[PDB]
Amino acid sequence: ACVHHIKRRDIVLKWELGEGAFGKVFLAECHNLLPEQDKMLVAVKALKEASESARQDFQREAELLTMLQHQHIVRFFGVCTEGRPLLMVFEYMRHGDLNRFLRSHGGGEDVAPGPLGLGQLLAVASQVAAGMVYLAGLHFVHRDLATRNCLVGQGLVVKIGDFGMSRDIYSTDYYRVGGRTMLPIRWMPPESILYRKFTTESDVWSFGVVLWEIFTYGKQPWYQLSNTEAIDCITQGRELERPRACPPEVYAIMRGCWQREPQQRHSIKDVHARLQALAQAPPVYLDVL
Numbered sequence: 001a002c003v004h005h006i007k008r009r010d011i012v013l014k015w016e017l018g019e020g021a022f023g024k025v026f027l028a029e030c031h032n033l034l035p036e037q038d039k040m041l042v043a044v045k046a047l048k049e050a051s052e053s054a055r056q057d058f059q060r061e062a063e064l065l066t067m068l069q070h071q072h073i074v075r076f077f078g079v080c081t082e083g084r085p086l087l088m089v090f091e092y093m094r095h096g097d098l099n100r101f102l103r104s105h106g107g108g109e110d111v112a113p114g115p116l117g118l119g120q121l122l123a124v125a126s127q128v129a130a131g132m133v134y135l136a137g138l139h140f141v142h143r144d145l146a147t148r149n150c151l152v153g154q155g156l157v158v159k160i161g162d163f164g165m166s167r168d169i170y171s172t173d174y175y176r177v178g179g180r181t182m183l184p185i186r187w188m189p190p191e192s193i194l195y196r197k198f199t200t201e202s203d204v205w206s207f208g209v210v211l212w213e214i215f216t217y218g219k220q221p222w223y224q225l226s227n228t229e230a231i232d233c234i235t236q237g238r239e240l241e242r243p244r245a246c247p248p249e250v251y252a253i254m255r256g257c258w259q260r261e262p263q264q265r266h267s268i269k270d271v272h273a274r275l276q277a278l279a280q281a282p283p284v285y286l287d288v289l
């Protein structure tokens with residue numbers, strides 16, 4: 001545990017932001033955290049119990065978070081383990097999760113009024129893709145990549161996480177098996193559902209489905225279908241349709257992520273490359289896409 005630590009007295013709770021079965025999130029002020037801010041806002045996760053079950057999973061999640069740090073991964077500042085309750089401290093991300101942001105832009109300080117423009121939808125996709133290049137670079141497999149597990153900050157910075165609360169707030173996006181197991185079948189490729197195999201390449205398939213959620217402003221993939229009807233479609237090889245707002249050039253990058261054979265899918269590095277070049281493209285070019 002080369003994990004950073006914060007003293008209880010440096011954290012001041014303001015109010016609740018959200019709740020899962022195994023946690024609560026608060027907005028707080030953290031003192032003496034950054035040289036040139038002596039006062040800044042953060043999001044704090046309180047652990048429900050402090051047993052054998054939940055305290056080992058805590059110091060494991062922390063070690064993971066400290067090693068994962070990059071421009072498009074959520075910023076983890078460290079733990080407070082003096083008395084209870086055990087707290088993890090993160091960067092505050094003012095627009096909340098990317099699914100909720102997409103749905104309420106389908107005007108302000110950070111975004112124009114009306115629906116998000118082609119250049120904005122590309123800027124979001126390109127950022128999530130840069131996160132998945134760093135993770136695939138450390139040979140780390142996510143297993144739950146979707147818009148509900150990304151966050152949006154001031155100036156539309158977009159960063160990946162993996163939040164405990166997503167099974168609680170968004171249970172409709174999971175199929176329940178056995179007792180306490182939940183699978184995001186709408187976001188999984190055929191080899192994940194049939195053979196239970198999870199790879200770098202099942203992540204790019206999931207990225208494909210994220211790019212689809214972005215270009216439908218937060219729509220549930222296969223929303224017309226029961227969980228069993230969605231598994232039948234995916235295993236029999238059927239593809240999600242091109243969203244209206246989706247240019248054919250972009251729907252071609254989605255298709256590249258959905259090639260039935262894992263080893264025929266484009267690498268995430270090529271996908272980020274295609275998306276960043278587009279997001280940065282001169283307007284004269286985006287206008288006729």
Ligand SMILES: COc1ccc(Cl)cc1NC(=O)Nc1ccc2nc(NC(=O)c3ccccc3)sc2c1
Pocket residue numbers: 017018025043045061064068073074090091092093094095096097151160161162163164165
């Ligand atoms: C196995 O763990 C991982 C593996 C791989 C990755 Cl890349 C990340 C994780 N872990 C997390 O990402 N953890 C997490 C959990 C809850 C939570 N609550 C937040 N919620 C707000 O910060 C929030 C912000 C604005 C409004 C409301 C809530 S951050 C967070 C991260």
